[PDB]
Amino acid sequence: EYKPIKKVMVANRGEIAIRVFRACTELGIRTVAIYSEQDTGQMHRQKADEAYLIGRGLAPVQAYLHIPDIIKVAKENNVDAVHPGYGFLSERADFAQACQDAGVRFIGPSPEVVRKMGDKVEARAIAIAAGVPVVPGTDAPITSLHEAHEFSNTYGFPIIFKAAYGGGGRGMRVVHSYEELEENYTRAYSEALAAFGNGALFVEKFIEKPRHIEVQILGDQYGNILHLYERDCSIQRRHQKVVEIAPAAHLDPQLRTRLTSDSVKLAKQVGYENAGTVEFLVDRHGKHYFIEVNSRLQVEHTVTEEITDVDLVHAQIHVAEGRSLPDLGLRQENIRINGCAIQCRVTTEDPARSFQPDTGRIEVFRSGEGMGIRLDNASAFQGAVISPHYDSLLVKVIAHGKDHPTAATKMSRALAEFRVRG
Amino acid sequence: QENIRINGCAIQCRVTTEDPARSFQPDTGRIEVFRSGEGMGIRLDNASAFQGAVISPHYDSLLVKVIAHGKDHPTAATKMSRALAEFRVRG
Amino acid sequence: HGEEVTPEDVLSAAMYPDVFAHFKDFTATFGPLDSLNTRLFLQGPKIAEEFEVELERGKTLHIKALAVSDLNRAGQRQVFFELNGQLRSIL
Ligand SMILES: Nc1ncnc2c1ncn2[C@@H]1O[C@H](COP(=O)(O)OP(=O)(O)NP(=O)(O)O)[C@@H](O)[C@H]1O
């Protein structure tokens, strides 16, 4: 109903750019692409209609983080909408505020919601405000061994330190005794103060057999919030996602509906109005403990996208247009379960030494197309050279079938069909 | 019977080395570039299409079979439009 | 040989028709010129060297020349070019 979008520009690289270009071409919207000098041999450059260079004299990883160049290139090319992707400016409210001040549309939540998210304190307070139980532990950041000692004495003996200033694993070590406790705390504090910024640490209860379930949330500006479905990704080598399964493995209907209701209530209370992810945690006895809320679109969205046969990028574009959810004809009672899907990622890590990423030149490449097999090629082609400056993703593969063993067997055949030499 | 149910719509197309201009006459030669266009609900079956392939003048002239599954007829029609636009077979 | 001829070309043809026809025939085959470097247009791409050609405001591309084959049977050579990330063979 509002000002239609005539041009969309994106600030990521690899598979997200390709996906959004397909989405825009489906709606007949002109595409604008950006790239760095050290990254001039990809495919998304020739896929779009026009391409421009950024970060001419910057670092290869820092070239995509320079806001003013993106702002001016968007201003000069009459760009109306910009997509943030994930992993590049998506979780920094400064870019969103600058885009809003520049008169360009931003595909995503308001800067206020982003600022509310991010740091764990505000999200944790909002969680305890209404339902959605969180893991027991300290509230304020802990920097003293004494208060850590009382916190360990009160709750339980096995504890793990969780740090701030970065969502990565960093120094996640678990304390099981007393003698190692002091030395581990001192080492973690030294690493936080030296290798990182704020030495904010928190003491909590490490779950012996964790199981985390994700839920997607889609919102509009008319105060309508719809949950897509749940996700399980318990396969973690250390703390990173490896293999994704689309539906719940074995969840009680009461558990799944209660989790859905809690996620919807949290989204409504925060008033989220775009596509985001809500992360929880399930114990063997069963206790949904809040972890965090992702304000961007996750890379593992394709499983839910395939189960419900709903295109999320089209939904995001149309909701950024202004059209309400009923206009799109998307209703919570209009979606249903259809089959199962398994998601896997092709990396260039040596699977023997330490999962250490490898570098080289691809000599032989063939791909496997199957029945419920869908492929997303990032930079895989004949005579390609992979750079160590960025991540090491070749192909994102999704396998869909009527049953979990069926999808597993189909994916096994598909990977057996893949042929990468060099 | 009860376990079979309709779910969505589908469109099927085949690419062929024939000239739609004069008489739908088949053409022979060597391909110099080939690219794929697989997407969200796009299924592709490649018979013989690779860089530097040679098309025999006496056998079948089928290269690729493309299929779209979508929620509605216009949706799948648009997916075929975009996928066929993405494909590039020159020479 | 007219598909989008403008009045400017109409007036140019009345000036020198023969060279206009020759120029149009040459441009149709080898493609759009005056996007190349002058030394590139006169001398050509030296082997094992990569250069850049600018086409439109965003359409920008790179070429690297690899090697040249020998005469096969009919006085024909094969040349291997390396585009942005791919390999093409021309005769
Ligand atoms: N059983 C557990 N008990 C307490 N904390 C845990 C437990 N398991 C995992 N955590 C934390 O869960 C986190 C998962 O790691 P990681 O996936 O890298 O964070 P993340 O979700 O990506 N954060 P972000 O980047 O903001 O999205 C690690 O810090 C783990 O230490």
Side-chain angles (χ1 to χ4, degrees):
Chain A
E1 295 85 5
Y2 280 34
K3 184 62 220 73
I5 297 169
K6 296 290 184 334
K7 193 166 283 188
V8 179
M9 183 278 288
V10 296
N12 289 47
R13 62 180 297 281
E15 51 76 21
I16 287 310
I18 298 294
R19 180 143 147 75
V20 299
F21 288 165
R22 310 266 190 70
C24 298
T25 313
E26 190 276 331
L27 300 168
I29 296 170
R30 295 274 286 182
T31 62
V32 176
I34 62 170
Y35 67 102
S36 56
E37 195 275 332
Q38 310 96 359
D39 198 1
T40 188
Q42 292 268 305
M43 271 185 298
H44 55 56
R45 198 163 67 69
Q46 64 184 357
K47 282 293 210 223
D49 298 315
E50 298 290 44
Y52 308 107
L53 191 146
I54 64 167
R56 184 171 300 72
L58 283 72
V61 66
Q62 298 300 110
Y64 288 83
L65 302 159
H66 187 273
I67 283 174
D69 291 331
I70 295 168
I71 289 297
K72 65 178 72 66
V73 69
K75 180 68 72 176
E76 191 275 331
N77 292 291
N78 297 115
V79 183
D80 189 358
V82 61
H83 194 277
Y86 65 89
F88 291 98
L89 277 296
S90 69
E91 300 294 327
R92 230 167 67 198
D94 52 27
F95 177 67
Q97 189 67 55
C99 182
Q100 177 173 290
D101 290 331
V104 190
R105 282 194 173 98
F106 182 76
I107 301 299
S110 71
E112 178 68 16
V113 179
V114 176
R115 210 211 47 71
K116 283 183 177 180
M117 295 298 102
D119 293 331
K120 271 72 67 179
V121 185
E122 311 96 333
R124 187 267 299 162
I126 290 157
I128 303 168
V132 56
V134 67
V135 291
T138 184
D139 293 338
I142 293 315
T143 54
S144 313
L145 191 42
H146 187 72
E147 56 186 359
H149 174 76
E150 288 87 6
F151 272 105
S152 177
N153 194 9
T154 293
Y155 290 135
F157 293 99
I159 62 172
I160 177 170
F161 286 16
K162 59 162 67 177
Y165 178 66
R170 315 220 313 181
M172 295 299 102
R173 292 199 154 88
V174 176
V175 168
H176 299 103
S177 64
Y178 285 100
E179 292 175 353
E180 298 173 344
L181 164 62
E182 296 93 8
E183 60 92 17
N184 279 320
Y185 153 80
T186 312
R187 186 271 311 157
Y189 191 72
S190 315
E191 288 298 322
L193 65 91
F196 312 120
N198 282 314
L201 293 173
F202 319 96
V203 162
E204 64 272 13
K205 269 221 185 174
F206 195 96
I207 305 310
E208 71 289 338
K209 297 240 169 198
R211 267 201 63 260
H212 62 301
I213 300 304
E214 271 173 298
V215 167
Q216 269 154 328
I217 289 295
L218 195 54
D220 61 355
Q221 70 276 17
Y222 294 75
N224 270 329
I225 290 173
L226 170 57
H227 80 96
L228 283 180
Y229 273 137
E230 317 165 335
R231 278 207 289 261
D232 191 338
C233 194
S234 294
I235 301 102
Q236 278 158 12
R237 161 82 159 78
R238 281 83 65 193
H239 292 351
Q240 70 274 19
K241 314 299 189 291
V242 191
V243 179
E244 298 85 338
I245 180 66
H250 284 287
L251 258 59
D252 299 332
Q254 53 271 51
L255 267 295
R256 63 94 185 166
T257 187
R258 176 69 266 171
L259 197 152
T260 297
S261 180
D262 291 334
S263 182
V264 166
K265 164 158 83 152
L266 193 144
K268 204 78 170 291
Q269 202 278 338
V270 184
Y272 202 67
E273 68 293 342
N274 291 111
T277 305
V278 179
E279 305 205 21
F280 285 161
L281 202 71
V282 180
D283 188 74
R284 301 281 69 75
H285 307 288
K287 310 277 154 191
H288 52 288
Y289 282 2
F290 177 69
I291 300 310
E292 62 167 304
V293 166
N294 293 295
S295 60
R296 86 220 171 265
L297 181 70
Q298 277 295 112
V299 65
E300 64 272 16
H301 67 293
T302 55
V303 285
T304 297
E305 184 177 2
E306 292 294 328
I307 297 304
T308 189
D309 206 351
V310 165
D311 207 346
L312 272 298
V313 295
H314 283 103
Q316 261 202 308
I317 276 172
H318 288 331
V319 69
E321 181 65 26
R323 269 188 277 177
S324 67
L325 292 203
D327 291 331
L328 277 296
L330 276 296
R331 287 272 71 78
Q332 188 172 359
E333 64 275 16
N334 220 335
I335 59 172
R336 52 154 189 182
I337 299 297
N338 204 280
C340 298
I342 297 181
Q343 172 46 224
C344 284
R345 191 144 58 259
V346 174
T347 60
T348 301
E349 51 87 10
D350 191 1
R353 50 188 72 250
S354 65
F355 292 174
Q356 191 270 332
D358 189 358
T359 63
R361 184 241 191 181
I362 294 296
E363 293 179 353
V364 166
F365 175 72
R366 274 184 287 271
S367 68
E369 62 273 15
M371 295 299 102
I373 300 299
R374 178 188 151 184
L375 188 153
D376 276 28
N377 44 0
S379 64
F381 48 91
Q382 182 66 77
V385 160
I386 62 170
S387 177
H389 294 88
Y390 306 116
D391 202 359
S392 58
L393 170 53
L394 283 72
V395 178
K396 193 203 52 188
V397 65
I398 191 66
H400 180 68
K402 46 186 49 182
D403 195 0
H404 191 207
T406 312
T409 318
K410 268 159 152 179
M411 181 95 98
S412 65
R413 203 267 302 156
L415 311 193
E417 182 58 90
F418 291 167
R419 195 149 310 297
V420 288
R421 299 292 179 90
Chain B
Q1 280 292 110
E2 53 274 12
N3 294 14
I4 282 162
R5 68 180 65 252
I6 288 279
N7 186 65
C9 296
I11 297 169
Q12 151 72 48
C13 297
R14 310 202 305 283
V15 63
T16 310
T17 175
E18 59 87 15
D19 264 7
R22 49 175 66 87
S23 63
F24 270 50
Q25 177 145 283
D27 183 8
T28 185
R30 170 185 177 267
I31 178 171
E32 293 82 3
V33 56
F34 174 77
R35 208 174 306 129
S36 85
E38 164 176 344
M40 211 285 277
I42 301 299
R43 178 180 142 179
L44 201 163
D45 277 29
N46 172 26
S48 65
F50 54 85
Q51 175 56 256
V54 186
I55 298 314
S56 69
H58 59 277
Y59 276 132
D60 195 359
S61 45
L62 192 173
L63 306 97
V64 178
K65 304 202 331 193
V66 65
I67 317 162
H69 166 240
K71 187 53 65 183
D72 284 312
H73 190 24
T75 318
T78 307
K79 308 193 78 44
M80 293 297 102
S81 308
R82 181 222 58 78
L84 271 185
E86 170 167 348
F87 262 59
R88 209 71 42 69
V89 173
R90 296 183 179 279
Chain C
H1 56 55
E3 51 272 11
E4 70 261 10
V5 181
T6 58
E8 295 87 338
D9 291 331
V10 175
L11 271 73
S12 294
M15 282 325 317
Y16 322 103
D18 206 298
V19 76
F20 174 83
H22 199 315
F23 160 70
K24 186 60 68 177
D25 271 350
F26 191 79
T27 312
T29 310
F30 287 94
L33 269 296
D34 66 90
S35 296
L36 298 174
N37 275 14
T38 297
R39 73 145 70 80
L40 174 55
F41 160 84
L42 292 172
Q43 198 198 357
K46 65 178 72 66
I47 305 308
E49 186 268 332
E50 179 267 358
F51 59 100
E52 181 146 40
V53 170
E54 172 56 340
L55 181 62
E56 294 296 328
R57 296 181 67 250
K59 313 275 193 204
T60 301
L61 55 86
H62 305 88
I63 309 96
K64 194 153 181 33
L66 299 176
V68 174
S69 70
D70 291 331
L71 296 86
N72 47 32
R73 289 305 309 107
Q76 216 185 36
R77 302 288 189 92
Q78 196 182 11
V79 180
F80 302 76
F81 290 100
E82 211 279 312
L83 183 63
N84 300 297
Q86 292 80 17
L87 298 171
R88 301 161 143 66
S89 277
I90 197 67
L91 290 175

